[PDB]
Amino acid sequence: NLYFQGAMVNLENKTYVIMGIANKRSIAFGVAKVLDQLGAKLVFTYRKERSRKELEKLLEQLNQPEAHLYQIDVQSDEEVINGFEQIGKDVGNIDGVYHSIAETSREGFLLAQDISSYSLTIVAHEAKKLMPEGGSIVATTYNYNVMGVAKASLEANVKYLALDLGPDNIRVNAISAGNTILKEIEERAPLKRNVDQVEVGKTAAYLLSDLSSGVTGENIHVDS
Amino acid sequence: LYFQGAMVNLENKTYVIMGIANKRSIAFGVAKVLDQLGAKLVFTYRKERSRKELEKLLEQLNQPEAHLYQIDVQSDEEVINGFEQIGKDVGNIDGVYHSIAFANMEDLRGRFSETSREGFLLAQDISSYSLTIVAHEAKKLMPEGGSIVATTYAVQNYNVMGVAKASLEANVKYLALDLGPDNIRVNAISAGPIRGFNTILKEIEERAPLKRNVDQVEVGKTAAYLLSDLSSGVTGENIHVD
Amino acid sequence: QGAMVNLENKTYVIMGIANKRSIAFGVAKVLDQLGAKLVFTYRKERSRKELEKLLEQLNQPEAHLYQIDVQSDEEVINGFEQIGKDVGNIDGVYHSIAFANMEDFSETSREGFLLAQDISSYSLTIVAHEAKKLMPEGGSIVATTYLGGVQNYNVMGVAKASLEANVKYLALDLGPDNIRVNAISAGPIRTGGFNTILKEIEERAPLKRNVDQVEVGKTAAYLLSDLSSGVTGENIHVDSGFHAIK
């Protein structure tokens, strides 16, 4: 009865925005390579206009007919609003967004909440508009530590964004990537980052596709 | 590691699927999904009734050779020998989808009181310990490693099954721990919620009331992700679908 | 290991009184009756006068009032320094923000998001850094959140998650200094369709009712006192068990 083998994931006629690639070693770059091989149409954002020349180079290792590169510093509203606006005109609606997340002072603390947590709120608020039929949003992470408070804040934000956007048929999820010193020592190996990239890419493919339908508000831990 | 996508399916993989009792069984959504992805499937069952329903359900699948094994998970003998025999017939496997038919838990429940010792231990036996002994015997068939997936699925006063479930979820995380050095991932799937006139109008349209929705295919898809190499860096996790 | 357990000869700074219905006022009555010396903070002159009327129902032989806006690094540092000079070392701080002050800038706005982070979570951090200085022999810091019930985006829900994480990291940080940090999650307090969910939580919660300010005060007394000397980094739900129905 069945004459052909089915594919678990296939992203042809799907468009995704991939944010926060800096270099060949970025976790998002491995997500790109994976989504590219699944035949997705990819759009890329970058913070500093001083690194557009690098993304262009990276995009060569990719099978992408036309290159869509946008400068968006997400700390700036106008760049996130305008940025996503352009995307809407250039490539139409999208299917999802991959977002790569980057006693102490008040400013130190609120800045980490801005950079590591609210960034997901504003991305989601603007990208919402290019997802009239539903879509999927993935966020990835890789005296006391405000970094730990910032991450806890984001995890919570994934949860509430999920309930919030659930009615719009928009799923929001997160990936957590990464004598316990032995493990930090390992993570230092080129081979190891390489392995991290493909594994997060594979897991993001699951979350960004219909393969993970019915899955929202979740935080999947990707390790080794 | 080299992804090489496009070729992303379960051709050449073999899984043991437990917990099918009929067309509506959630484990049947899993079976259909894996079947369409190219996997070879081995099925377990406790009751004859369930074996005949399986023989019928295989009609709608694309398994050349049918593989049905009677295993009552409450019997060590039947788990050990069942799995031994699976290895003889089919060789090494890639994973197990662990589940208990919804029928088993409702009949062997109206027997004991929610509060009874016997009731409590029986829920713990079938719902949690079954996974431990299943993993221990299936492990013998996954020498290069593999993937095990356990699913999670009427209260009067005391919800004894709620406790069996929590027990199972912890069982999963500790198996994940114990089995990592053997390259065997262990994960769970649960029903998801967290992890006025228009409602009435919605009901009027369905010609029916709206209740607990768990979609068999949505479970099969997540199961396939968890049983596949897609999820290579994922263990001791609990994924909520709904 | 002695007979009496009460708050005699203990001194606590209480934050978060706006009016007679503030959870913090419930805490104050409880602590007062147990014998503690209370120092009160406020920001607005409104809440300064209000505290003056409310102190007249307690048994403080003295009103200790300090103006401390938690949004100001200067006021927190100087305020706690004055307290130190006026009253000496303290045994703890009750930290909360009055529900009244939460007076509804856009839910999804960057400012909105960060103001909640600033008010609900960071205020604990700086309060703890300055109060630490008055607790050289250790002490107890309690942080309370209130389910203040909601268009689409639960921005305060994020802020709460932040506070809770903050409690735990402070408890880890301040532990060697012998200073305990804990949180209280107060259920809804009856204090018309907005809050017809006091009826939902009620009938659904295990204890089949709502809690009140005084019940929160009882748990705060426990956390501030030596009865909980081995307890830090916790989060106690004073909510008729509603938390458990998940």
Place this chain on the structure above:
Amino acid sequence: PMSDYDIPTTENLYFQGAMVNLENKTYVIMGIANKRSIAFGVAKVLDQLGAKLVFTYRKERSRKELEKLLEQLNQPEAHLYQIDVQSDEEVINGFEQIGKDVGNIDGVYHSIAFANMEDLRGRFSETSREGFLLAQDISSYSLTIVAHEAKKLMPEGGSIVATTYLGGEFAVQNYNVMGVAKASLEANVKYLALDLGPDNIRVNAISAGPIRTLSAFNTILKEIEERAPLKRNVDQVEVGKTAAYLLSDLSSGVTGENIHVDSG
């Protein structure tokens, strides 16, 4: 900008309020074996706060011990019942007799036992069905049977506390199965809280000991070897103090909770 003025005191309180007072309360205390028992610390504490105390024991050696420890408490009346929780009839009869002797109680304190067995010596995936289910029966079901009988003595409501002490008994290769029995207990606490809430019976747990957590690893061996001095001594009193909070009106509105009592 501050204020520091006098308020008249003529209408103030004349006495010292007590945070916890247990004078008209009766508690059943389970789990005392010797002077080092966590439950003996709870006893000391509840006694010093005026509670009427009843004690259950399993072994005879513990009965002798209880008679010796009672002379350190201020209980005009001794009341000792043999109750083995592994037995339905013993739990049912025991609380029956307690009811006949002292009438209604205000709560129960239950030390959670963890049985040592053969399965503790091996890997978790090798755990026998019997070993697994024994851990479940002892460490988790125990709380169900006790709540079931004790609630018969709490018509107007009460408070139930279960305590797990993570000490040397956990320094085994197969702490995993104890982990699973513990996880089962935490959930039992919550589902009992749900079940008994409508009866105004609160159910809570305390976790204590030199081991921080069993979550998912012989870091556990080091936590044991590196115990603080007098670790069980401080825990005895600090658990007792927390138990007093949970067993009394001081913790009203609080149910389904697990409070971690760790002085580190």
